[PDB]
Design a protein around this nucleic acid. Sequence first.
RNA 1: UGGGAGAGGGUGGUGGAAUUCCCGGAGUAGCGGUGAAAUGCGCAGAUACCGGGAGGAACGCCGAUGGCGAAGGCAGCCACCUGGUCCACCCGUGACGCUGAGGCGCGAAAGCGUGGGGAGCAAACCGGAUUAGAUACCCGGGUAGUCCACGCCCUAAACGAUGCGCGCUAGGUCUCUGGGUCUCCUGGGGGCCGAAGCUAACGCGUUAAGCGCGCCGCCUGGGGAGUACGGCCGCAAGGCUGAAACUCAAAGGAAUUGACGGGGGCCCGCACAAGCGGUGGAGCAUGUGGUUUAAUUCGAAGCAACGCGAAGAACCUUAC
Lengths: 114, 68, 155
Amino acid sequence: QVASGRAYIHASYNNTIVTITDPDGNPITWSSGGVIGYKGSRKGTPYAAQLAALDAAKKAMAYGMQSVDVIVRGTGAGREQAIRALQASGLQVKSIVDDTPVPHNGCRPKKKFR
Amino acid sequence: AKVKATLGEFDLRDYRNVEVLKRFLSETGKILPRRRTGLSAKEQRILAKTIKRARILGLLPFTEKLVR
Amino acid sequence: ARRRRAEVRQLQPDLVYGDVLVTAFINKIMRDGKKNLAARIFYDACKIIQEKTGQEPLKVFKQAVENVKPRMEVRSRRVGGANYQVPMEVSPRRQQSLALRWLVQAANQRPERRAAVRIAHELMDAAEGKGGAVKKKEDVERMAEANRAYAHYRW
RNA sequence: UGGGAGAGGGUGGUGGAAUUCCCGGAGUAGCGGUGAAAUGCGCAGAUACCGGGAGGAACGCCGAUGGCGAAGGCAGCCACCUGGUCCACCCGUGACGCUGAGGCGCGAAAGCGUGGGGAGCAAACCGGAUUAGAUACCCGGGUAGUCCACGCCCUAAACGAUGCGCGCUAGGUCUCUGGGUCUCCUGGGGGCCGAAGCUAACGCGUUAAGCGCGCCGCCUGGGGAGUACGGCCGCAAGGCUGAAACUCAAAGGAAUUGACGGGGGCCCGCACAAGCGGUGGAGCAUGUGGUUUAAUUCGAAGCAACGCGAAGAACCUUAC
């Protein structure tokens, strides 16, 4: 049971994942569109990205989590929509941070990104 | 509104000038464009490599994180 | 329908209840322009609702409609290789049309042999917010709510 | 001589991000992927999050229409070695110059030899989709290869599709790099628009495709064919040089008018959509195709032929 922690936002284009973690980084709980109940294309939908944050929001307050860090790793359309679902979730969204890891410049991407 | 424009005399080669060099990093630690700094290409060229030193020299971040 | 918007027609209000909506609901019952027959069948159900659950027939009518007026509906859209069903709002115009269409059609499927009773039972269920016309509004806005994730596909 | 810029090159180092994998922690029922989906991975605990480690590769920001190089090509930063080049001084020599058949050297990528390494990506291959099929396009894997050393290979849309050197011929503008006396001028590169001119046109145009000169390479219709043969080189792939028979009456370049487009923009139409009512279902009328008899007269064939010519076939009509 903890009220302050970390909220991660893994927003892809095929899916979104929201992981409620403690301030120590350990995962309190997580959620994805597939867990919200959607499949295939529907997971990456923005509205699904909201609901995944909602369910993740509940499980936070399920452990008394009152306000956490808004850590964002992703670029999908469901990224901005998930930010609301934390904000109106009865949690104090405190630190909205972009942590989309970009290489500098790193490995060869797939064919899909060329 | 160039970054250099708000500066007095300073060496672009003084890589230990982390304060002035702090100005020319992005909000995310990226290197600002010339359009933000107005340096010459020669000036800009002096800027980037020197900045890269401070990054390897740890005086400056390779990358920040965006705080919306 | 490209240039103008094809504004709706101003329905002549009914003689009895002085309503356009009532006159509107008449025409959905009207067949072949047989408005006189359709007029009675409504006015007959007027008496029935005036008799079975004796109240203001008009107030029961509008109460029936509001219990069945939808507000969210899907719309087919072949985005990509997928024929989606985007949920959409509804202007009060199409809200009334869909409501009026359903209450008639739901009334067109009851078992009782005559129409005005079917209308009467329909308005009774409708004013009670029950029956097929309500279910339809229930099913649509539910189904419209089922695809809320597709909302951004709207246009 | 004094200076300047530079991803110019070699070597040796060395910084971080990111991926991947491993380890440890926390945690659960999905992840991932697509147009959708599936394969697949996951309960044996994945993804998502955190810390630590290993390793390989590549250098985000700067960054540029920028720079450098003869070309290929060159980009994290440091140091060393080293090349080319520009500016100013007008100091030295005094024609010592240009080209350049061969030869020599370099020469992306792929590929090959050996050895090493091997993160990601990914030929070949496997599977899932899609399909009528899909030896593909998309996805999941996935090995050579991709990276290093050395040795080969020598091809390319190796393109400015523009050999080099030099001189002259409006200009404007942008850009980088020097000098100055910093309005400006003087130089060296890199783009844009354009005089004259040239150009078949497109366009070129002081970075000529103009005007000239010197030198080299190259073309003589298309295909046959960069193939055959031969010769040389190559480990190999193959490369270089390079025909003919036969065959066609054209193959071509540019641009014009259209047309087309599963290009774009803009508009529009019961074209879609919102509705209402229909046909296709049944029987019948009628028209027609095809069958059939002497014959089913003939015509109309998508829209725009088919209750049409036929607004009247018992004989007539009527054409059989």
